[PDB]
Scaffold this active site. Sequence first.
Site, mmCIF file in Angstrom:
data_model
loop_
_atom_site.group_PDB
_atom_site.id
_atom_site.type_symbol
_atom_site.label_atom_id
_atom_site.label_comp_id
_atom_site.label_asym_id
_atom_site.label_seq_id
_atom_site.Cartn_x
_atom_site.Cartn_y
_atom_site.Cartn_z
ATOM 1 N N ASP A 10 10.620 12.441 -7.991
ATOM 2 C CA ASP A 10 10.885 11.024 -7.766
ATOM 3 C C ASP A 10 10.925 10.320 -9.113
ATOM 4 O OD1 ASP A 10 11.183 8.485 -6.618
ATOM 5 O OD2 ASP A 10 9.013 8.174 -6.695
ATOM 6 N N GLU A 762 15.506 11.830 -6.307
ATOM 7 C CA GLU A 762 15.693 10.558 -5.630
ATOM 8 C C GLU A 762 15.255 9.441 -6.569
ATOM 9 O OE1 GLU A 762 13.287 8.323 -4.252
ATOM 10 O OE2 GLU A 762 14.886 7.035 -3.482
ATOM 11 N N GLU A 766 14.454 -0.819 -9.832
ATOM 12 C CA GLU A 766 13.973 -1.397 -11.082
ATOM 13 C C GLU A 766 13.322 -2.759 -10.848
ATOM 14 O OE1 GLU A 766 15.280 -4.157 -12.977
ATOM 15 O OE2 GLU A 766 13.869 -3.787 -14.618
ATOM 16 N N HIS A 840 20.367 -15.208 4.176
ATOM 17 C CA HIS A 840 21.444 -14.758 3.306
ATOM 18 C C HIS A 840 22.760 -15.411 3.712
ATOM 19 C CE1 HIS A 840 18.429 -11.653 2.548
ATOM 20 N NE2 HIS A 840 19.126 -11.267 1.495
ATOM 21 N N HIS A 983 3.663 7.472 -5.339
ATOM 22 C CA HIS A 983 4.761 8.211 -5.956
ATOM 23 C C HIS A 983 4.721 9.683 -5.566
ATOM 24 C CE1 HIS A 983 6.019 4.761 -8.220
ATOM 25 N NE2 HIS A 983 4.871 4.670 -8.867
ATOM 26 N N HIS A 1225 -15.252 -16.059 5.496
ATOM 27 C CA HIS A 1225 -13.982 -16.095 6.210
ATOM 28 C C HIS A 1225 -13.937 -15.116 7.376
ATOM 29 C CE1 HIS A 1225 -12.061 -18.832 3.411
ATOM 30 N NE2 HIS A 1225 -12.509 -18.102 2.405
ATOM 31 N N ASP A 1256 -9.391 -18.784 -1.010
ATOM 32 C CA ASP A 1256 -9.327 -19.868 -1.974
ATOM 33 C C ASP A 1256 -10.110 -19.581 -3.244
ATOM 34 O OD1 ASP A 1256 -7.900 -21.363 -0.004
ATOM 35 O OD2 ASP A 1256 -9.817 -21.911 0.918
#
EC number: 3.1.-.-
Length: 1296
Positions: A10, A762, A766, A840, A983, A1225, A1256
Amino acid sequence: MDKKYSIGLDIGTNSVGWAVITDEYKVPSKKFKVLGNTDRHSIKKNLIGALLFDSGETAEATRLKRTARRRYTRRKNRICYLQEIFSNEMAKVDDSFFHRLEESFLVEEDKKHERHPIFGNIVDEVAYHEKYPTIYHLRKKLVDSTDKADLRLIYLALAHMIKFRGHFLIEGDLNPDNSDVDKLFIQLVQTYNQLFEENPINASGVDAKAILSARLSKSRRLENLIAQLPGEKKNGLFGNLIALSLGLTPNFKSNFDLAEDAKLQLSKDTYDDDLDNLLAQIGDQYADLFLAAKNLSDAILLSDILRVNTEITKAPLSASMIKRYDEHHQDLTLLKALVRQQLPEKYKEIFFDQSKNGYAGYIDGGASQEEFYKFIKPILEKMDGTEELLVKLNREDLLRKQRTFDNGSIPHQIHLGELHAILRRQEDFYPFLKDNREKIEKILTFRIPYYVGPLARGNSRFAWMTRKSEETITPWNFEEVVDKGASAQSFIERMTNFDKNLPNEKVLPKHSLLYEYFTVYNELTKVKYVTEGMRKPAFLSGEQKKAIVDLLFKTNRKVTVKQLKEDYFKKIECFDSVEISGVEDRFNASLGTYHDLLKIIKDKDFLDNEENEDILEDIVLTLTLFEDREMIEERLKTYAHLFDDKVMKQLKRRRYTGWGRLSRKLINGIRDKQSGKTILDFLKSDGFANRNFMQLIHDDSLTFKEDIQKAQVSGQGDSLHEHIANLAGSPAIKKGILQTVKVVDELVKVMGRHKPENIVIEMARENQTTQKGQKNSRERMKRIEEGIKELGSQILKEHPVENTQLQNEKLYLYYLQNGRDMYVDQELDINRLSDYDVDHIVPQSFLKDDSIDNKVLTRSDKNRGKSDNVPSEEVVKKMKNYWRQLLNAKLITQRKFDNLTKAERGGLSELDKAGFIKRQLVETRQITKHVAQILDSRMNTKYDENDKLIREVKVITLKSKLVSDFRKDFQFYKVREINNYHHAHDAYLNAVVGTALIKKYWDKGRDFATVRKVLSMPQVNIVKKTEVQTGGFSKESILPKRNSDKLIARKKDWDPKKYGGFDSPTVAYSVLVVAKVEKGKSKKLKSVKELLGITIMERSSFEKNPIDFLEAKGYKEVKKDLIIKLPKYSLFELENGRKRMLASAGELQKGNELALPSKYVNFLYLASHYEKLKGSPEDNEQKQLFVEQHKHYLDEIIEQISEFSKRVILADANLDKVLSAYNKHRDKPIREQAENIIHLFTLTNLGAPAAFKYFDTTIDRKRYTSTKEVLDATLIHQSITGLYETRIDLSQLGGD
DNA sequence: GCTATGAGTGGCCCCTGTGGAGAGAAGCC
DNA sequence: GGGGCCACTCATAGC
RNA sequence: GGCUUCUCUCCACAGGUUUUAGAGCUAGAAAUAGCAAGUUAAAAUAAGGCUAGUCCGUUAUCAACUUGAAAAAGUGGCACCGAGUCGGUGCU
């Protein structure tokens, strides 16, 4: 039994995943030898890992700094030249004057002569500074005064002009006297009326001064002025004249009924010759028209620069600056008076405090102009009598400095005129000035033309100048020494490519004659014709081809099929009906260059005579290579005996562009040994064969092909990987390709050298940098300000737009559309935008785009209105005008407007829908092919007995979409924020899927269990590639003087305590040193063991002789054998498996990877996209239920993070802060819990610590700022895959 | 008692703006 | 984005 | 065939920063208080290097050990059962 195995890879911009799998998809594990001095001699590891490295950089910064260095050296040279001229006279008046100028930067302690630089005595200095407050006053004085002045002031004026001579963009002489816009506009109108009494222009009452001096685009100004003239048109003759005066390039073909294009541009260097050409065609009566146009253009430009200077003098620039200074003085007095009279309390703030943005900061501090205006504007409005001050503030004219960033517009001709005026006025008193006036003027005017390049004497790799005589080059004798023409030829050639078939031959120009003949004969080669009585189509004979070419191609620019049928078959060969096959309504090849040369030379036999072929080719090459006409004249002068003067002039005017693909030697340079014919000869006549270029180069019966494979030489200039350097792409991908190759080699080495069965490659996506993206964001910010100012929307001026609002597409797109929806136009408020959804331009399913240009803001209801379709056409029509307005505002990108036009055209159809879908799926995948080719070449190296490459190894290319689909289908989710195992997992899946699909063209019970086992392994090899840092010596900002030892001198004899300097040198690498140091006032020797940082600046000195460099630093009794070179990201191991990487001489990074069980990863992925599932509702509900049921895993995740932190991170306060925040939380919705927890892993990520946001509460980064604890660690050296390790225990080195 | 260091913690800091001339390779059409 | 520098405050080892 | 985007090379410009020069004055032992002034100029702009050029100095390349100036070359057993950064067993 060589265990059959496959390798997965990869390749990314930052990582290279590698995995080794057998035929059963199992990942084998092996026992590996460990070198060093520890007890751990054998360690077992899995054959999987991923390699991490720093992204490569392009060369842009280096080029920029190199060019800057050259400018600085040459400016120093110009000052030296002027001083060399003046030296003989300046010796008599004041000997030490140049010493005082040179050493002025030294303190009074270190000066060798008297401290005042100019006169060396205080009284004359004080009188000078009172009489001429600024150098511009001296300039005006010397220009206007007729009296003899002191030579020193003359030197000052001349030096100031030379060292800041200004730009060269405008070429040709300019008249500063033309500064009245209205007068010259009226004169041009009167001249037009005199030449066109039948069509007078009513320009009375038109304020051309306001329109032309308006700060708008040139075309907008042209439209604005013409709109005020009744009956006059934009493209008309007067409109063209106005466009010329604006600096545009009007076309005079139509206004004068001309056969050829007539474009004139004043900013072009060839204005004189082109204007003379136009006059030679339309008549000399119009010369005054274009002269008036030039005067108008000069007036426009000068009024735009100098803002309406009034008083008559030959030095407008100096007068303008003096006037600006006087207004500054008056306004400062007025402001002091008003502030003191109304607001006495703030006088000290505004006029004394340097750290603020007040006037004291604006002058003495670092404050720029914009900040001063921003601070002073509110105070002025709170006081009375500030109308003029406020008006000047809005005009950027209050309290303006003389030296400001707007001066970049000053053409050098102003300075040249002032220079010549001074020399003319003072030449009577100083005879030596008279003889050197041309030298002094040329020193200002001269520059090295861009096509020559650096004047190097062979010792520079960037140089291409060819020198005639070995004398030193000086600005006065540049012409005699440097060959300009050959220089330009080389300059163009070295950039051009080479012929693929003959790598040692240069490619011919596009419009070369032989190229046109080759293309014509190649196209006519395969043309078939059918006449009455013919059973089969027949090929054209050589005689037929010659006749057809001579009859049509040499007589018409473009030849069509109908033209051939009506001209050759029926008229010459007497065939009434003929069918032509293989030719589509016209022939692509055309003798356009031949027809042009026929029109110019007007000699058919001269063109048709093969003896002239070399001359014609050299002429065409000359027209292609050179763009300045003088050089063209210079080379064409060789053939001036064959052509008359008018023909010579005509050739100097034609220009061609572009380069072909084939060389002369390939087509008509090489000859067949058996026949003696070239490829052109065979194409002209091949008989019954009629073999084309492809056949001729691939025919085994001829020597051409055989010579071709003879020429193919597998050369590797410098190293072999220079092949990799030649690939198309950024170096970011290239560094990764090289790493991938070396990783494959080492894996083959480890497995036992038996070749892998199959290899899967493969490519990932970027990602741009944050800092450069931030500068892009700033430019986009200023463009937004420009756009909104043209809109006039007032909401932005209350709160300046933030970089995040640019990065957040929603607000930026809101500013692009001026708060108006783009599907259907209505006012939108940002609070409603919070609800609105961005979509789009292209439908999402048909094509998806990462770029911001396609992804455009829209209101939510109209976003839902259309799906899987382009927007409805009529509303796009009504939006098109508003889109044009935004384009005029420059808010929307041009490509975005192109997408909008595509939407209104309708664009995609069903077949084109499939095209766009396959087109979003497809990636250019061109570099990938080269990677595959390199791997194939390195692996398959055996040729069979027939010299055919035996392919034992199959190179495979896949696409990331297949792997993503595989992951989504079987719940192999991946989350990037967890750790770096992603990866390796991607590489493993690549290999598995590729092998499976090739075998198919799989046991659903066993295989999936094996895969789940593989993804659950805790041991995955992660290696950070060790790199020696290079780059700048330090930060570039020079810091003020201060009592410290951490400052570095700018020069050899410039003490930092007295002169300041640079700061923060980047440490190239650290060295472990064991020696003795004198400590205390007693200077007692103590044995110590510490890390010493080597600066990049000192690297050569250290490598040359380590012992002396260590001694000079104060260390004593250095043990040479213990000098261990430790680069950045060197690895250390401490107790409990806690690992650190050496960031520099004094800081460390986290070195351990969190192994998180896969079920938690699946849970987090499902929780993160809980509202964004893209699948069947049943499976969506099942996933939602699965998320709900295992809610108690959240505490489990917190527990594992806590344990891992307590074991390897040691961030007690930060961990407590995290825990305290979590309980607060605990009732938040699960999706928010997941999104906050995902950010939490940033504490445990590998690498440099960074801050993060949790709900926060913001947690600052914890930095490891002490390197003592690793002085007794176990050093690890890892091979590029991490399989081979050598462990050195530093605790046994240099014990006390 | 007095001297000196070192160790950690928090906070701030990082050169920028443009023009012209070219040879090359790839998005969407 | 990540390393360098500084002020402050505590600690610490020696004397 | 059209467009823009991106890699690479050259020639220029405008700033910014640093130190110094541009007599600060008055009261006051000083601290300090009041008052005046402020816009410009020189030089450097990666330490420097020898090949001495009106040139070159921030790209790319770099686990450890042996042989090499460098480029480069050489150097590290296998099988099975398990898995918290890899562990155990048998053969060699």
